Write a protein that binds this ligand. Structure first.
Ligand SMILES: OC[C@H]1O[C@H](O[C@H]2[C@H](O)[C@@H](O)[C@@H](O[C@H]3[C@H](O)[C@@H](O)[C@@H](O)O[C@@H]3CO)O[C@@H]2CO)[C@H](O)[C@@H](O)[C@@H]1O
Ligand SMILES: OC[C@H]1O[C@H](O[C@H]2[C@H](O)[C@@H](O)[C@@H](O[C@H]3[C@H](O)[C@@H](O)[C@@H](O)O[C@@H]3CO)O[C@@H]2CO)[C@H](O)[C@@H](O)[C@@H]1O
Ligand SMILES: [Cl-]
Ligand SMILES: [Cl-]
Ligand SMILES: [Cl-]
Ligand SMILES: [Cl-]
Ligand SMILES: [Cl-]
Ligand SMILES: [Cl-]
Ligand SMILES: [Cl-]
Ligand SMILES: [Cl-]
Ligand SMILES: [Cl-]
Ligand SMILES: [Cl-]
Lengths: 474, 474
């Protein structure tokens, strides 16, 4: 489980975790509470998996977009700041940690990608994506290349995709229509197409990932890269003289980065909820705290109004905010992970040539708009079905297809719930399994239990719904 | 298979099949072609099952509503009458055998249910359903009952259900919205409710079926029944003095029978298509022909204008047409069978008390609006998927998760088709099986075949679609 007394903190390996450990120590010098800071791999995946059972860190750091999922799963303890404190952080940033009218994490900083150029290799950076092929040609001559960024992650290639019309889920009347996915429209295609063409023409390489691009840029091998504030430190170390400017335009429109807001959320299974709140509110979210971290690795435009008033002077932050405004805040809904995985795949297959732009995006659209089982299960309230089945058993203890020689002398609300598993039978099964589990202990007899299994088994048919071929009800 | 030279005809056991055999003989006396007339059980089920392989009758008789399904399955040969002939039959009736802008059967007669009363027991039949409980009470005293009709079939109980708002599929802009099902609205509930209440109060019995009601009425045991023209003969035999009148009203509206049009369709696998056409056009659809049949058992309002001009004089036919007009023509779409099965179930469970009106209807709505696998398969054009997979194999004969040490140095349109099986995985499987079958013969090698199976197997995943847990590709 989770030790009471200490604070364990998870944050991604590309963030200023050393800078955060310092705030960990200042907090310890004043508190005596041991603050541990870790940067595991795939922590945004691991957390859902571990916080579920009741383990993991007290605090979890990631971009706001994943927290909706965590919330829906009941993994995040709600956070509640006295009005005053809230007045210190930008409205904009508070919204990003708001799910179902609740605050589920603490905002830290606003992130957005910008175009980063080597002032040596390229005094004047291009205004347009279209300009780039010419450049690379020119640069290849001098033994260099025009541009290199991470292609393995959608986050990076999305600003171009989004430029001429691409979007994730439309925002219709105060909500996201997760059936209205715009990754397969003219714009998205145009964008991804241009991207692939760059590859087809030897201007960049489908296999290029983060570290490869970072190294290339930091060793002065390519004129341009695309990245976020976090990456500024390593360059500051690298002897390269760099500028940070607005991303190029495509078909005349600005690239539109998915703006994300670094957030800190408290494990809803942690004993140290108070300590956590005090840490984040009184130490991290302070001018010294943020600075300590921002020193290790730049946060972008911090959530706290006072320190940002300082940071704003930095031209790099200006360009960061410029790109951010051209962009859109990522949604934080549960379906976002689906969307991301979907697009990650499309981009890769298209980039690698396994598929065509039109095909890959078409698959992404289909898949990103498909509801996942785990989500549906969490949202399910299966009690009505439980109650129904129990009752039905009493009325069959003395009254077609009878169970025993003795049988041979709520339903709506339940079915309403099961309706949600009508398009995924494996899922329908899981829902039945969940029902079983939630009752096995309340089942006295055994005639009782198996006369429950069989009833449970043809429950979907009773609702006029589709049913699994097989379904183990251990 | 089907013998060339003879004509085999299927018609339901409750129709004037003897009367039709006569036209069978007059046709034989003039032709020498042996005409066989049979009335098998569940012939509307058997036919789809047998006509599929290429057997069955040359001609198939049923209400128009089932023929849409037969058509979609390619079981019905299109029928084409010279304008003149068509001018002999009512427009209304031609529409009923029209599917996808094609004539798929020959209209014979218009059917509709009416209220049939014993003039001895009840000189003045009720205007309203509401009046009936009082009657039955009064009649039970005299040792009789007010009303008895078939409860095992939805066809009979639907006029009441439909009365105050019930419908099958809404007709939206020239088409039926099979997702807009009106069997679970206030009206339908009201209607079914009244019906169940009749039962709950000992006014009728949930177990009452056709023969039980017919016998009861024909032996003068109940004052009223609800039935169609076909039933007139047996009563004519029965010494009971009966009238045929408009069905009672419910909540102030007329009962609304599903008007059906007896149709004759030609097996699209029969060699005798010409004979069939000549039989139906030149013998059956004539004043003598129809009469011969109408003699055995009344057809209702026949499709042929001339004979109906005669029949119209019969007050019984008048009442039949009155009820028909208060009613609605059944749709002939493939989904109709689903709808009927769904409602048959609801009615029975509600009537039997296994479920409540609200629950049962709610299940019917859900289920009647659910697309069936066989339908989706028929409508599927899986070629694109076939072509795609074949090609993909060539491009893998020398180029992640490789098949052989050698591999280790259309898609959209296809997926568009597979999208249709996204809510039924068993079905997705069948679609893959169909693809396999349609290629096993075109597959030279064996490395070829199994390198096809594996590709085929993760085809849904390539389309971002859901996939079966298991799928045998024999
Ligand atoms: O590619 C598959 C992948 O998608 C998911 O990651 C996304 C995040 O949810 C999202 O916040 C963003 O990640 C970036 C941050 O905003 C930023 O601080 C910095 O770390 O760069 C990040 C990108 O590498 O975008 C990504 C998608 O690219 C998802 O959460 C994962 O589970 C998954 O493996
Ligand atoms: O109840 C289950 C059942 O539904 C289907 O039968 C329907 C028919 O499609 C339909 O034409 C109608 O059947 C009647 C005729 O119109 C009439 O000529 C006479 O025969 O009375 C009939 C009713 O018994 O209504 C029924 C539904 O009640 C379906 O086709 C069957 O497969 C099925 O078993
Ligand atoms: Cl690790
Ligand atoms: Cl909480
Ligand atoms: Cl307060
Ligand atoms: Cl969006
Ligand atoms: Cl478009
Ligand atoms: Cl038989
Ligand atoms: Cl044909
Ligand atoms: Cl003609
Ligand atoms: Cl209708
Ligand atoms: Cl309603």
């Amino acid at each position: 489980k989770i030790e009471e007394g200490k604070l364990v903190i998870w944050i991604n390996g590309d963030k200023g975790y050393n800078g955060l450990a310092e705030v960990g120590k200042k907090f310890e010098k004043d508190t005596g509470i041991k603050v541990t800071v870790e940067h595991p791999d795939k922590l945004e995946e691991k957390f859902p998996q571990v916080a579920a059972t009741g383990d993991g860190p007290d605090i979890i750091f990631w971009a706001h977009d994943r927290f909706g999922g965590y919330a829906q799963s009941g993994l995040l303890a709600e956070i509640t700041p006295a009005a005053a404190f809230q007045d210190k952080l930008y409205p904009f940033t508070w919204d990003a940690v708001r799910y179902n009218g609740k605050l589920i994490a603490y905002p830290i900083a606003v992130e957005a990608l910008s175009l980063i150029y080597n002032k040596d290799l390229l005094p004047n950076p291009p205004k347009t994506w279209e300009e780039i092929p010419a450049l690379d040609k020119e640069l290849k001559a001098k033994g260099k290349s025009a541009l290199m960024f991470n292609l393995q992650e959608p986050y990076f290639t999305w600003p171009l995709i989004a430029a001429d019309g691409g979007y994730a889920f439309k925002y219709a009347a105060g909500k996201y229509d997760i059936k209205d996915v715009g990754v397969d429209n003219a714009g998205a295609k145009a964008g991804l197409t241009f991207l692939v063409d760059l590859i087809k023409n030897k201007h960049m390489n489908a296999d290029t990932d983060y570290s490869i691009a970072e190294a290339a840029f930091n060793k002065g091998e390519t004129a341009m890269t695309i990245n976020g504030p976090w990456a500024w430190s390593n360059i500051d170390t690298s002897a390269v003289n760099y500028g940070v400017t607005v991303l190029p335009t495509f078909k005349g429109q600005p690239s539109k980065p998915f703006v994300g807001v670094l957030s800190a959320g408290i494990n809803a299974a942690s004993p140290n909820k108070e300590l956590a709140k005090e840490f984040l509110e009184n130490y991290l979210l302070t001018d010294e705290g943020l600075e300590a971290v921002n020193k290790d690795k730049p946060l972008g435009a911090v959530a706290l109004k006072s320190y940002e008033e300082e940071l704003a002077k930095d031209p790099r932050i200006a360009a960061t905010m410029e790109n951010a405004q051209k962009g859109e805040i990522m949604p934080n809904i549960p379906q976002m992970s689906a969307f991301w995985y979907a697009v990650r795949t499309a981009v890769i297959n298209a980039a690698s040539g396994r598929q065509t732009v039109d095909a890959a995006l078409a698959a992404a659209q289909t898949n990103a708009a498909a509801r996942r089982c785990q989500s549906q299960l969490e949202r399910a309230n299966l009690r009505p079905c439980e109650q129904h089945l129990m009752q039905k058993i009493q009325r069959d203890e003395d009254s077609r297809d009878p169970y025993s020689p003795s049988q041979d002398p709520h339903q709506e609300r339940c079915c309403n719930e099961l309706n949600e598993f009508e398009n995924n039978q494996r899922c329908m099964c899981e829902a039945l399994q969940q029902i079983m589990e939630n009752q096995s202990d309340r089942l006295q007899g055994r005639q009782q239990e198996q006369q429950f299994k069989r009833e449970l088994r043809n429950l979907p048919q009773q609702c006029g719904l589709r049913a699994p071929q097989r379904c183990d009800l251990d």
